[PDB]
Amino acid sequence: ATKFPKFSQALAQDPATRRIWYGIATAHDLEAHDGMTEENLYQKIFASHFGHLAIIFLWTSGNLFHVAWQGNFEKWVSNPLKTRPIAHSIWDPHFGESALKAFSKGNTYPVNITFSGLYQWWYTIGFRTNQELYKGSIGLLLLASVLLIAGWLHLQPKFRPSLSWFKNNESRLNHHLSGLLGFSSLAWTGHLVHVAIPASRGVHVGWDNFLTTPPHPAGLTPFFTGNWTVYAENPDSATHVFNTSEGSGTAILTFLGGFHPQTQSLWLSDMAHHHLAIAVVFIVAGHMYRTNFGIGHNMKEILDAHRPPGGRLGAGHVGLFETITNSLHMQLGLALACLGVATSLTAQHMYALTPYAYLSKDFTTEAALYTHHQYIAGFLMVGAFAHGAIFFVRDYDPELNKNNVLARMLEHKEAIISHLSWASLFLGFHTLGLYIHNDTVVAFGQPEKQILFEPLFAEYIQAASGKAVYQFNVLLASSTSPATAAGNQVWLPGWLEAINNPKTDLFLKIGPGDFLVHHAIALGLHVTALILVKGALDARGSKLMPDKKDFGYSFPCDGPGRGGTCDISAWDAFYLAMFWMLNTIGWVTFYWHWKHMTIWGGNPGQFDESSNYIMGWLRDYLWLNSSPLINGYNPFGMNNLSVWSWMFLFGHLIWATGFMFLISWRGYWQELIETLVWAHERTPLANLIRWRDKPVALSIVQARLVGLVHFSVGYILTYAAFVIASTSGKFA
Amino acid sequence: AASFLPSILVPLVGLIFPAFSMALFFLYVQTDD
């Protein structure tokens, strides 16, 4: 093309403003660009990945640099529980003198406090001085440059990888599993043993003395001799003060279980052992596929041979090998799905099994991290289903996958969708019904008539791991259980202490109130899934539009006929599911925050009793904890929470603005724009200036996207302010 | 002194840079190669 969308003649030859809008949003769909060959596609994608990696490293470099140049890491290291971590400095020419003072509280210059947890992580991993952080930043800047060079290099004529190289699954998997994940873990345990653990005990091991400071007194003698037990002897005493030698030990690899008494975090020795074990597992697993050395498995054969003899699963997995290798969308979907689960797990396990020192005592940071990863997880999950649908519309070959496990899924689509619908209905009616019953009776002044179910099943699981409050004498909660006998001399001692300590988030106590919220979360997952799954299955066709596959993943509609076909494309399913995703994640995050807020405040009872009905959430959570935020700036002054206060209102604006695009549709606006064109052409003086791109209204799908973005941005921003200002304003 | 950098770079990054970038994009999208 000769216009902006060089990759699309259709858009390029467009006489309106759409040319600009669409060109920007269709830029990264390399597969649909004019004149795209598969080889070029893969090559360009590979190079683009190098660029993304570089951006990630530049981002990390910046955090280190700004903390080192404008932060208080060293002071924090000295007094971790009495210093507020600094992120970066503030230079806003719009600030008033008062603001300069407010944001400069506790320091000598206006500054922003970090709620990212970097200080704790770096403290745990070994960083003790600002100069060290600087070196890291410089190194990452260099690595970023190297990655950029690689992107250019592999796009050059003699270094462009072949399409075959891009499809050698065995070699990549072997290498990625054994080297990227396995050896990297081994390297990490090396760092922990050589640098981190020594630092925790007061010894400095850096690039200056690492080659002459043995990690363990015995040496590598025990390792090669086979007497590995030596490395687990003399674990740090329970009276050990972190970052000092008082009460220190010599152990480097142990399975103590539990948390360091003073830092209330997992033992470093245990983490080292953890990564060492994981390393061996992955390195071994990376020797499973054939890679030009004779031995190994061929993935195609494995998939083809797996067909249940009964025939209940049809022809089995035959045909899937080719489908996956020849479809980038399916690959992306599988990846996003797994990463989404991982992100949720990080959030869930990181607040219970605190990994970093003094992180549990920083309430605001702990709250931010959870909400951060949970939201990212939602986006990652939705994307997986989205690309799954794109696959069906674009890359699915009905003939190749004949009676395959995948095809049969599309044969009982109605069954799946219908049953998922029933589940959603059941959960919805009863969950809401029970909440309303509890609200009404309480309102009428009769709280004794509430329907409160104890979460017995969950309580049982907690007891099974050792919790004793519930009084369920089972498994690890039983002294006579075979399980207890097994680990009583291994890891249970430490675990049974933490699990039965009320001041830890390991298996928090649950009650009737938790039962209901969990069932609400269930509703969210099921309903969000219904929308996404339906979109995927009904993406290649439906009774209303039996030829949907010929129109694509995203199209405005199919006309006002046959009853009306608005929002009938698969893209619209993503659009609709996004709202539900936000709602469910919101419920999850609200639950975590309120529960923890009450615990931190010392009144766990408030949640226990007020969480049973809806008014409690509104009055004892949203209304009560909004007081610090809404008073960031008042008719009498301002404080450091002013920025957070302003953002809260800003979020509401964006959210509501989104509604305009969602409820108002194109026809109205197009007609109005026409009148404006008339005016400009008929008004003297302004007539001198004219447009080169005809002014037109936004398209149907465009408006949907714009609206969803406005809704989403406002949603996240408003909650971000609340979770931070409320927690910090009250406990910090 | 490095301390003066915040007051010398921020004006440029938030005002001069964005302007020139937007101008270039306009010229790029309004040109008919």
């Binding site: 190079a47 140049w69 600087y134 410089i138 440059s145 | 490095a2």
Partner: peptide, 29 residues
């Protein structure tokens, strides 16, 4: 304390990244 020289060195490194970034972008174009 990060010295001025250290800060200036960092800035020089960033510049290299920038010039190498423009090229990658223009090569992908």
């Amino acid at each position: 304390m990060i010295t001025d020289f250290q800060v200036y060195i960092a800035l020089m490194a960033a510049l290299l990244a920038s010039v190498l970034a423009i090229r990658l972008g223009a090569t992908l174009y």
